[PDB]
Amino acid sequence: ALETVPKDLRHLRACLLCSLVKTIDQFEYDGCDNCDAYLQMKGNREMVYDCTSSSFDGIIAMMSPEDSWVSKWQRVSNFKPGVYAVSVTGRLPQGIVRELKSRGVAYKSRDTAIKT
Amino acid sequence: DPNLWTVKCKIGEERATAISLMRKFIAYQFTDTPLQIKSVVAPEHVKGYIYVEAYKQTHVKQAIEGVGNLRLGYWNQQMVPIKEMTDVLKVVKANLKPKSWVRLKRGIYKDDIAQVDYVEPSQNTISLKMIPRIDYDRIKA
Ligand SMILES: [Zn+2]
């Protein structure tokens, strides 16, 4: 859709669960689409900087999760189309990750990149 | 499994090409001439060409028509082996973490190692640790 497309290249962040790369204005107004009920992002800015982090590299133009090898490798087949990444460095604090497992959300590390 | 193709591009324009391609796909997805491209990879370390995912060469050949940026890489479509379908996504250590060591390019402390202390969420300025090198105003006039 036209709501998930980044509008301006400057001031872009990325999520850590589904690695959703968009613009800060969309994050403040729309927020993470693939996971909204379990993350509570729409209607505030502090949580954006709490969970999402700008430390990420790599961009991919994802259009068909159901039929693509990159999606299977990244484990993002059950997500909506959009611009994702391949390496998001970061880790959520010990106050938000706890409730994800209780509600039936498996927290995995999307930082597929290697260290040294 | 789908194949990954390679197309040449200009040096310094990789995110603009990606956003233009996504806009074209979104604008021409409900028409009689859709795009069969699955995905494109634009790694940050590489600069000078981009990748594209599709089964046949005709798909990407007819999907990059009209664009004025990929005109250079239009008469040749190279195919990479299946073993290279996993090294492109690899990244060697983004690169923004506090209490880390970074280097400077401009200023006076050129080619010197420093250390990060605090990061501003505004993404406009960042603190840095370094030992001063000035002469304390004794040599200069
Ligand atoms: Zn996410």
Kindly report the three-state secondary structure assignment for every residue of chain B.
CCCEEEEECCCCCCHHHHHHHHHHHHHCCCCCCCCCCCECEECCCCCCEEEEECCCHHHHHHHCCCCCCCCHHHCCCEECCHHHHCCCCCCCCCCCCCCCCCECCCCCCCCCECECCCECCCCCCECCECCCCCCCCCCCC
Which residue type, as a one-letter code, is found at position B40?
Answer: V
CA distance A19 to chain B (A): 13
Beta carbons of A33 and A17 less than 8 angstroms apart? no
The partner residues of A59 in beta bridges, in order of sequence, read: B42
Output the six-digit token pair for A90: 């970061």
Which residue type, as a one-letter code, is found at position A33?
Answer: D
Beta carbons of A13 and A84 less than 8 angstroms apart? no
Beta carbons of B20 and B92 less than 8 angstroms apart? no
Which residues are within 8 A (CB) of A101 and not within 5 positions of it... i.e. 6 or more apart?
A107
**Contact residues on chain A for B98, CB-CB shorter than 8 A:** none
Place of tokens 């202390």: B117
Judge: B18–A59 Cβ closer than 8 Å, yes or no.
yes
CA distance B77 to chain A (A): 19
CA–CA separation, B22 and B31 (whole Å): 15
Q: Find the CB nearest A5 among B23, B93, B94.
A: B23
Output the six-digit token pair for B14: 């990789």
CA–CA separation, B15 and B47 (whole Å): 11
The end-to-end CA distance of chain B, in Å, is: 71
- The domains found in chain A, sorted by start residue, are 1-104 (3.30.40.210)
A51 touches chain B (CB under 8 A): no
Experimental method: cryo-EM
Beta carbons of A13 and A31 less than 8 angstroms apart? no
Judge: B2–A68 Cβ closer than 8 Å, yes or no.
yes
**Residue B10 burial class via C-beta count within 10 angstroms: exposed 0-12, middle 13-18, buried 19 and up:** middle
Task: Give chain A's largest Cα–Cα span.
Answer: 39
Beta carbons of A72 and A58 less than 8 angstroms apart? no
Helix (H, G, I), strand (E, B) or coil at A61: strand
Length of chain B: 141
Length of chain A: 116
Q: B137: phi > 0 → left, psi -120 to 50 → alpha, else beta; which?
A: left
**Contact residues on chain A for B97, CB-CB shorter than 8 A:** 55, 89
CA dihedral angle for residue A39, residue A41, residue A42, residue A47, rounded to 10 degrees:
150
Which residues are within 8 A (CB) of B50 and not within 5 positions of it... i.e. 6 or more apart?
B7, B9, B14, B17, B18, B40, B41, B42
The reply to whether A51 sits in an annotated binding site is: no
What resolution (Å)? Answer: 2.9
Interface probe for A, chosen from B84, B91, B101, B124 (most Cβ of A below 10 Å), is: B91
**Contact residues on chain B for A114, CB-CB shorter than 8 A:** 90-93
Which residues are within 8 A (CB) of B14 and not within 5 positions of it... i.e. 6 or more apart?
B42, B46, B47, B50
Beta carbons of A114 and B90 less than 8 angstroms apart? yes
Q: Find the CB nearest A87 among B15, B22, B94.
A: B94
Alpha carbon A6 to its chain's center: 13
